[PDB]
Amino acid sequence: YNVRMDTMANILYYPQKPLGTTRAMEYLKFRELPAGQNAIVAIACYSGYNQEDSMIMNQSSIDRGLFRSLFFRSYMDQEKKYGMSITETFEKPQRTNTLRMKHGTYDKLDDDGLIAPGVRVSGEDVIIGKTTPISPDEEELGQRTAYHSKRDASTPLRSTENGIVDQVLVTTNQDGLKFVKVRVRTTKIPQIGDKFASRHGQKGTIGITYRREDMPFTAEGIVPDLIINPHAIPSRMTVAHLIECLLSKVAALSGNEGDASPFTDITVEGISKLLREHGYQSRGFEVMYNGHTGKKLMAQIFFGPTYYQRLRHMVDDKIHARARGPMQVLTRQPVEGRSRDGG
Amino acid sequence: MNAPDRFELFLLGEGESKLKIDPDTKAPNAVVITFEKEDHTLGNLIRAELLNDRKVLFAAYKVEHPFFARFKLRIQTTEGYDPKDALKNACNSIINKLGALKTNFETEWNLQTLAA
Amino acid sequence: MIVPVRCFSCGKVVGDKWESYLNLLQEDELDEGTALSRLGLKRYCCRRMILTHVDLIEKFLRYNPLEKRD
Amino acid sequence: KRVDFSARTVISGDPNLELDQVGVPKSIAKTLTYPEVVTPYNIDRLTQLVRNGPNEHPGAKYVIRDSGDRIDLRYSKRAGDIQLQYGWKVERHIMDNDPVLFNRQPSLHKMSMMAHRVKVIPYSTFRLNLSVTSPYNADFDGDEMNLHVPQSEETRAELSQLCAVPLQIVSPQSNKPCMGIVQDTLCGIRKLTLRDTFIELDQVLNMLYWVPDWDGVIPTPAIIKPKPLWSGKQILSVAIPNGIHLQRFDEGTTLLS
Amino acid sequence: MVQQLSLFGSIGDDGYDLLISTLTTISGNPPLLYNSLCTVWKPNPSYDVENVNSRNQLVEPNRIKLSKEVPFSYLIDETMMDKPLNFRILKSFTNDKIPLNYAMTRNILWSLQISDIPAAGNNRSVSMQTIAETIILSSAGKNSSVSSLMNGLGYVFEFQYLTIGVKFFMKHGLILELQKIWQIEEAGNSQITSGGFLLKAYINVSRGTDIDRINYTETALMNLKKELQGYIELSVPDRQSMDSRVAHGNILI
Amino acid sequence: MGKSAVIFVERATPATLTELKDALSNSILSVRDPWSIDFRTYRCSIKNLPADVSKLMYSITFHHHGRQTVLIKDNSAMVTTAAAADIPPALVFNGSSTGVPESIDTILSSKLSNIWMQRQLIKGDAGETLILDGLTVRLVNLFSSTGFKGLLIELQADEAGEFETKIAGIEGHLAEIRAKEYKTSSDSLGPDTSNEICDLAYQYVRALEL
Amino acid sequence: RAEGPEELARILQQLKLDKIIHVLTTMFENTWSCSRIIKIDKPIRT
Amino acid sequence: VLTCPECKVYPPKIVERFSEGDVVCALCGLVLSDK
Amino acid sequence: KYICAECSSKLSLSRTDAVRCKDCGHRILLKARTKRLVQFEAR
Amino acid sequence: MSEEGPQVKIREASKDNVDFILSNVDLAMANSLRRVMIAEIPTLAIDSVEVETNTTVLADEFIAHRLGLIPLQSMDIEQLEYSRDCFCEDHCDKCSVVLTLQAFGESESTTNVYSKDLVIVSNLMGRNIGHPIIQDKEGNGVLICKLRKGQELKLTCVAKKGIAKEHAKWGPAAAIEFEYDPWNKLKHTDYWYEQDSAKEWPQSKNCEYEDPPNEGDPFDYKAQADTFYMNVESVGSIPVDQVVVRGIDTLQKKVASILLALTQMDQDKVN
């Protein structure tokens, strides 16, 4: 993925191969390019911030790098050749002989008109400088002055995208015209409003994040990386979620890959027997204390590792507001599009 | 992004008072005391110590929303006795207990090092 | 992708032990559970960190950021 | 048709919010506005708001004169210079306890478009009480809802006296409540009121403090000796108002159940 | 910080003595002599203030005024001790020459003052201006001097001038001033207000938010102006003339 | 001519002020009204500066000495007032002043904000002042943004004959309370020109520096 | 500005008491260093 | 031609706010043309 | 400055020169990172 | 010996782990002590990086985040100052530490970039601080990155002082075990069983330190929680006994701040 200048790309920092793998995966190569992480999950009620598919997450886990993803974007441009004269040039525009300049900061551009790798671009900055010569007989209905011999054709960044320019490429196309491609990098961190899913149709959003002190803990000082609600189990009858939890816990405690292929001889009682060899309550329950006051909890809690995947929907890509702004040419009504700040 | 800065958990803003005391209008000899930039660590300790005074009737605390670091404490004591005095006695007792605990731990650790 | 320096759950450090952990697997021909316990990994969350790690840094390293095809 | 002064974002659950109150992110509150009229009762706060500027919440973003001219506060250095008069308008940010209209698509019935009171919060999600998710047919696995801001006094009064969440509890399709205790609060209010459940002193004190309508009186326990204890029914009775009477006889229940 | 509400005008010296009689007939108070010396300081051009937020214009550079009172013993020459110290001496102050020269003022080197351009709009009947003021009481150190202080802040001297005139105190805090202004340079002293007196009537308001007081002040100023109809025409000066920012240079005199 | 000295203790405890108040209780003659003090530092935001030109400017605000601010830079002092009762009558009369000035801190932090910007702020409130035999001692706890900073002691006397003996006595009194790391100062800004409040502000600056 | 007859009687009693106290304190000072700082929690038994 | 009726400065200094659909004088902050 | 895409040869190109490598003759050229590291604040 | 106060019995100790019993104490006090031991003890960690050359296969903020978690010696952290209080511009000599990292892959075989290669170039003024924490046998410590032939990395690091309430990197304690009442004499937990609850639930190691209850004894309805069993492990920066002592000191200072503010407010009320 390092070279390719795709329109969009997402990469995960640390991927983990699942603790419970089907035998067929050895042909899809899912243990070479995983798509999630093993998260400790405690199924419980705790403070009422995980109801109706929400979840609660440990903030220290976030801070140490769990579910952190790189993001990569790219843009392209090329010089156009109208007629026989080159009507577009790659050069840093100057306000002396240019009209209709954009409010973005042209300062970061080099003399070539192309920004250089390693510069923190931001909202509405420009990364490619493009100037269009205009024939003298063409006047913008009195807008043009005597010295405005050229027009601006630069490409500003999308209004929200921020980050660091990562690569710049110069080539030529079939017609011999110049060709520039810019690739930009960014980092994405989970936050209230993201989207996560398990392998059994159980997906939700983060509803609040807690620090390790307010997290309920076991007698051994272990803390759940996340907490889900038990009101999601009955009507969905996802017993495979519970079985996967139990088997993954046994494999983590033991240290060997646990088969979970369909139509085989593994049973629940067998893995419960293998669990009790290690020293835990056979049905996966455990004793946990309250994080605030330190007391004991009346009811025990189902506890163990699972596999989760970070889906493609972030709240930063869905948030939009508008007081006023551009209209439409024909109907004169607010435009369509979030990237074009419409209604 | 709308994520507030983390240092707002332990640095008071300018014009902020660490304590705010307000008389309670329902029960006689009752005060509501707001603490800023603090969480259960202090409120639980202070309430558990205030429950040991035979002249203290009521002592309860709460943290209304887990976004903001602040909490409320409520005290009610017997006639002829000031809730602020009760708070002062509780803090003194806590400090003495912690000092004794530190001395004991240091003695035990040094004894272990001698036995190490 | 190089091994995480710290454990996401209990705050412990596992980053330095990866090199020595790989040694026990083929030089001493031990099993995974005993090798994991030989390095003081006792909570199963640390065992989770070390056990399920996909080391992708040895593939990018045979490669350059210039000229991938499709 | 498309409109102005509106936002769209995912939702989440907040058990600490009141029934008819919505958590609005900070930036969305910094973008939308409201045209407040300068009067003798507000000129001090409005002056401080203008001095604050557009990069700070609370603040302001535009000032409209009597003649219709509008001054952008950002370019005009006159955040500390403009003197306000009677009849001018300050386009201020949206402040706590401002009515808004809130809905989810598709809007099949009357109860899918309701009014709310704002509370400005960090982070990027909307906040709702966990009992209004039934009229909206909405959960928190990725649903986005829409927010519309009124821009006048008559419109604000209409949103506050007609479409408010409190007034939409007895639905007229089937003349029965459309909201109630749901999910885990319902699972808990049942484990609390069994005959088995007894409560000690400290927890009773904290629980009685949590009820914001308490009157400072401690209920006399039910087991005075040899140890004071409280029954869950007793503590839960504090929430229920006074003067409420209810009788329900199930199968095979006598006057001593 | 005050909101100063002002009206301006000018008169020829020929009517000067008759004007002074009429004022005495209205106010009931006599004139009181006064003088002052103002020095204008501007930000140092050697220092590049990149902190001016060019993309937002949060602030623009401005000029600082330092004022001080100077005793009349520096303004009276050897021909004038015989006359008593009162308003009549102004009748002899018609020449561009003055006893106070450049060297004495250089030897001198208070009230520190900053202002802004008056409020915009054409529905204003009096010049409303905002003033921020402070006072310097004393100093010490190895370089205790006004010049060293203003160079420490980051300002340098631009010019200076001397005002001499009379004051009338009327009711409601209204102050009326008759002035003569002498610009001073090493090249010499030149009277800008040549052959005339500059008239300025003004009131101060302590709080800009109070609007009942501002309305009362405007009522008093317009009543005063309507009293002097036919004798002297009091007018609102040009809004672009009372602008004292460094970027653009002009000086109402 | 009165003399003054300032001693700052960095490693003090919250209760050290009470310890020093009680350890001196035998000689305490009376007690007076509480006092307060403010201490700001302003920084130069311009980069084209000479090497020999300092970058900081210390502003000390005295609340008990009639609400007066003192600006200090490179051993140069400046004293500004903001009360209408401290105005010399000539400036009011001639028209050089509108009569209701502002504190210089507002001027620095409102109009000149593109040359000077605030960097820190150290405050002291609810101090105690005690009259001993021919002496006045003021104590206060210093609070920064983070929290408690240290203890501040300022001594003022009218007769300068035995000032050093009193300073030594107070140092010994701190010595029995085992406060061994204390920085004291009684320097004078100008050997020939003696201004009391300027010298006090300079002593505060010399004591509070890190 | 006194409000109650008991308040008035207490005021007169305090008047006599502190008048005597002032007289004797002046007698001591005209010859003695009193202390105006010391406050004892419990009055000394007679 | 578009000029500020209060600054009266030639040539006029003007900035267009595209995201708000406004044309704003860069000196007095006055809004010239909307939408 | 620029850099080749196969051999990563160090080249300098003007505003009129052909966009090619001198040694390998390829038509793909990459830039060079800003030699002077520039400090920034994320806002 | 202080017989009126909390009692302590250390059973086990090492460079990393302390294992002990805390008796004659409330439950609130022990809980607050553990909360402070995890969250509110200062330490020294890298807080800013600036990079000169990066010819690796990883990103820049990737390596920055990796560097921000490496542990460094912070024994004398009481003599540094919060960078928001020091009068210096940017970073002080009294309110920061500075290190440099340089590496180049000259050899054909890939070369690992560990944390033993961080070199300190600032002035320490005779304080024991800034040294990297090394706990493995070979001494290499935290491995940071990987290099090939013809790849170089050059960067500079600024490390500062803070707490764990703002980032997980400043925390000195890994995980602390907190147990009490292994026989459930007080009836604080209610067990979940299929046939026999007394057999399905295993027994804690701590049962040997109390005597089992007898079936003939009625439920004791007057006891309170008094004995706690704790175990504390350190990341490595601070010695563990210092972790406990500094937690106690921090709790004391917080209560003393409350006391001082209350006394100030009472003096204000006097006015």
For residues E134 and F100, the answer to whether their CB atoms sit within 8 Å is no
Tokens of E122: 């054409």
E189: which residues sit within 8 A by CB, 6+ positions away?
A: E96, E97, E98, E100, E101, E182, E183
D155: which residues sit within 8 A by CB, 6+ positions away?
A: none
* Residue closest to F33 by CA, chosen among F117, F104, F114, F136: F136
Which candidate in A53, A112, A166, A214 is catalytic?
Answer: A53
* Residue closest to A273 by CA, chosen among A250, A256, A255, A253: A250
Domain shared by J28 and J78, yes or no = no
What residue type is G45 in one-letter code? R
**Under DSSP, is residue G13 helix (H, G, I), strand (E, B) or coil?**
helix
Domain shared by J142 and J219, yes or no = no
Q: According to the annotation, is J88 in a ligand binding site?
A: yes
* Residue closest to A279 by CA, chosen among A215, A220, A217: A220
Q: How far apart are CA F155 and CA F5, in angstroms?
A: 5
Tokens of F161: 């004959």
Q: What are the residues facing E157 on neighbouring strands?
A: E41
Q: Which CATH number does the domain housing residue B56 bear?
A: 3.30.1360.10
**H or E, element range at A240:** helix A239-254
> Which residues in J lie closer than 8 A to residue A294 (C-beta atoms)?
27-28, 30-31, 34, 178
CB contact under 8 A, D76 and H29: yes
For residues F131 and J250, the answer to whether their CB atoms sit within 8 Å is no
* H30/chain A closest Cα distance in angstroms: 17
D72 interfaces chain A, CB cutoff of 8 Å: no
Tokens of J96: 């920061």
For residues J122 and J156, the answer to whether their CB atoms sit within 8 Å is no
Technique used: cryo-EM
Which residue range(s) make up the domain with I42? 1-43
Q: How far apart are CA E220 and CA E175, in angstroms?
A: 11
Q: How far apart are CA F94 and CA F109, in angstroms?
A: 29
Q: How far apart are CA I38 and CA F90, in angstroms?
A: 56
* E155/chain H closest Cα distance in angstroms: 24
Q: How far apart are CA D118 and CA D98, in angstroms?
A: 6
J93 interfaces chain I, CB cutoff of 8 Å: no
Do D and B touch, 3+ Cβ pairs within 8 Å? The answer is: yes
Domain shared by J118 and J163, yes or no = yes
Tokens of C62: 């045979």
Q: How far apart are CA J116 and CA J99, in angstroms?
A: 12
D83 vs E57, E60, E208: nearest CB: E208
CB contact under 8 A, J174 and C10: yes
> Which residues in A lie closer than 8 A to residue I34 (C-beta atoms)?
116-119
Q: Are strands E175-185 and E155-169 parallel, antiparallel or unpaired?
A: antiparallel
Query: What number of helices (H) and strands (E) belong to chain A?
Result: 4, 23
Write out chain B in H/E/C secondary structure.
Answer: CCCCCHHHHCCCCCCCCCEEEEECCCCCCEEEEEEECCCHHHHHHHHHHHCCCCCEEEEEEECCCCCCCEEEEEEEECCCCCHHHHHHHHHHHHHHHHHHHHHHHHHHHHHHHHHC
Tally of structural domains, chain I: 1
* Residue closest to D60 by CA, chosen among D82, D39, D41, D87: D82
Which chain D residue has its CA at the smallest distance from H29's CA?
A: D76
> Which residues in E lie closer than 8 A to residue D44 (C-beta atoms)?
209
Rg (CA), chain I: 14
Q: How far apart are CA H30 and CA J100, in angstroms?
A: 52
Q: Which residue ranges of A are tagged as binding site for Mg(2+)?
A: 53
**H or E, element range at J162:** strand J152-162
For residues I3 and I33, the answer to whether their CB atoms sit within 8 Å is no
CB contact under 8 A, D218 and B59: no
Q: How far apart are CA J67 and CA J44, in angstroms?
A: 13
Q: In this structure, what DSSP letter does residue C53 have? A: B
- Last residue in a domain, options J168, J202, J220: J168
Rg (CA), chain F: 19
J188 interfaces chain D, CB cutoff of 8 Å: no
Tally of structural domains, chain B: 1
> Which residues in A lie closer than 8 A to residue C12 (C-beta atoms)?
none
Q: Which CATH number does the domain housing residue I20 bear?
A: 2.20.28.30
- Please report where in the chains the tokens 């501007």 appear, as a residue: E42
CB contact under 8 A, E240 and H28: no
* Residue closest to D125 by CA, chosen among A341, A315, B4, A62: A315
Burial of A282-321, coded b for 16+ CB within 10 Å and e otherwise, reads bbbbbbbbebbbbbbbeebbbbbbbbbbbeebbbeeebbb
Q: Phi/psi zone of residue E78: left (φ > 0), alpha (ψ -120 to 50 degrees), beta? A: alpha
- Specify whether A125 is catalytic: no
Half-sphere exposure for B81 (CA within 13 Å, toward CB): 14
A208 vs B39, B40, B66: nearest CB: B66
User: How many other β-carbons are positioned within 10 Å of the β-carbon of residue D208?
Assistant: 19
Q: How far apart are CA A326 and CA A334, in angstroms?
A: 6
Q: What angle is formed at CA A204 by the lines to CA A203 and CA A208, rounded to 5 degrees?
A: 150
* Residue closest to A248 by CA, chosen among A57, A19, A45, A78: A19
Whole-angstrom CA distances from J265 to A228, B16, B84 are: 45, 13, 10
* F64/chain E closest Cα distance in angstroms: 17
For residues B86 and B53, the answer to whether their CB atoms sit within 8 Å is yes
E69: which residues sit within 8 A by CB, 6+ positions away?
A: E34, E35, E36, E37, F90, F91, F94, F96
Q: According to the annotation, is H2 in a ligand binding site?
A: no
Q: Are strands A203-210 and A54-58 parallel, antiparallel or unpaired?
A: parallel
> Which residues in D lie closer than 8 A to residue H21 (C-beta atoms)?
none
Domain shared by J215 and J262, yes or no = yes
Q: According to the annotation, is J92 in a ligand binding site?
A: yes
J100: which residues sit within 8 A by CB, 6+ positions away?
A: J118, J119, J121, J155, J156, J157
Which residue range(s) make up the domain with B11? 1-115
Q: How far apart are CA A208 and CA A59, in angstroms?
A: 9
Best to test chain B binding among A292, A295, A320 (most B CBs inside 10 Å): A292
CB contact under 8 A, B42 and J25: no
Domain shared by J49 and J83, yes or no = yes
* Domains of chain C, first to last: 1-66 (1.10.10.60)
Q: How far apart are CA D131 and CA D136, in angstroms?
A: 10
User: Cis bond leading into D106, ω under 30°?
Assistant: yes
Give the ranges where chain E is alpha helix by DSSP (H): 16-27, 102-108, 146-153, 211-227
First to last CA, chain C: 22
Do H and C touch, 3+ Cβ pairs within 8 Å? The answer is: no
Treating both helix axes as pointing N-terminal to C-terminal, what angle do B40-50 and B83-115 enclose, rounded to 10 degrees? 110
Which chain D residue has its CA at the smallest distance from J222's CA?
A: D227
> Which residues in B lie closer than 8 A to residue J259 (C-beta atoms)?
88, 91-92, 95
For residues A245 and A272, the answer to whether their CB atoms sit within 8 Å is no
E251: which residues sit within 8 A by CB, 6+ positions away?
A: none
- Please report where in the chains the tokens 């986005």 appear, as a residue: D144
For residues D93 and D29, the answer to whether their CB atoms sit within 8 Å is yes
What DSSP string describes J202-239?
A: PPPGGGGGSPPPPTTSPP-SS-----EEEEEEE-SSS-
CB contact under 8 A, J110 and C61: yes
Domain shared by J48 and J26, yes or no = no
For residues J26 and J227, the answer to whether their CB atoms sit within 8 Å is no
Q: In this structure, what DSSP letter does residue E173 have? A: G
For residues C39 and C17, the answer to whether their CB atoms sit within 8 Å is yes
CB contact under 8 A, C67 and I5: yes
**Under DSSP, is residue E60 helix (H, G, I), strand (E, B) or coil?**
coil
User: How many other β-carbons are positioned within 10 Å of the β-carbon of residue E10?
Assistant: 16
For residues F73 and E152, the answer to whether their CB atoms sit within 8 Å is yes
CB contact under 8 A, H20 and A325: yes
First to last CA, chain J: 44
Treating both helix axes as pointing N-terminal to C-terminal, what angle do B83-115 and J240-270 enclose, rounded to 10 degrees? 160
I29 vs A116, A122, A171: nearest CB: A171
D71 interfaces chain H, CB cutoff of 8 Å: yes
* Residue closest to A249 by CA, chosen among A206, A201, A200, A285: A285
Q: Are strands A37-43 and A226-228 parallel, antiparallel or unpaired?
A: parallel
I32 interfaces chain C, CB cutoff of 8 Å: no
Domain shared by J164 and J175, yes or no = no
A323 vs D5, D15, D130: nearest CB: D5
D75 interfaces chain H, CB cutoff of 8 Å: yes
Q: In degrees rounded to 5, what are phi and psi of residue F77?
A: -115, 155
Q: What angle is formed at CA E17 by the lines to CA E12 and CA E18, rounded to 5 degrees?
A: 90
C10 vs A16, A19, A221: nearest CB: A221
CB contact under 8 A, A205 and D28: no
Exposed, middle or buried by CB within 10 Å (0-12, 13-18, 19+), for H29? buried
Which residue range(s) make up the domain with J262? 4-42+169-268
For residues F21 and F175, the answer to whether their CB atoms sit within 8 Å is no
- Last residue in a domain, options J111, J134, J168: J168
Exposed, middle or buried by CB within 10 Å (0-12, 13-18, 19+), for A148? middle
A117 vs I33, I42, I43: nearest CB: I33
D191 interfaces chain J, CB cutoff of 8 Å: no
Whole-angstrom CA distances from E11 to B101, E92, E233, H11 are: 89, 17, 9, 37
> Which residues in B lie closer than 8 A to residue F146 (C-beta atoms)?
11
Tally of structural domains, chain J: 2
Q: How far apart are CA A46 and CA J210, in angstroms?
A: 31
Tokens of B22: 């307000």
Q: How far apart are CA J101 and CA J53, in angstroms?
A: 11
Best to test chain I binding among A131, A171, A174, A177 (most I CBs inside 10 Å): A171
Domain shared by J10 and J24, yes or no = yes
* Residue closest to A303 by CA, chosen among A116, A39, A88, A122: A39
Chains in touch with D (≥3 Cβ pairs < 8 A): A, B, E, H, J
**H or E, element range at E159:** strand E155-169
Q: What are the residues facing A321 on neighbouring strands?
A: D7
H30: which residues sit within 8 A by CB, 6+ positions away?
A: D69, D70, D71, D72, D76, H4, H6, H24
> Which residues in H lie closer than 8 A to residue E117 (C-beta atoms)?
none
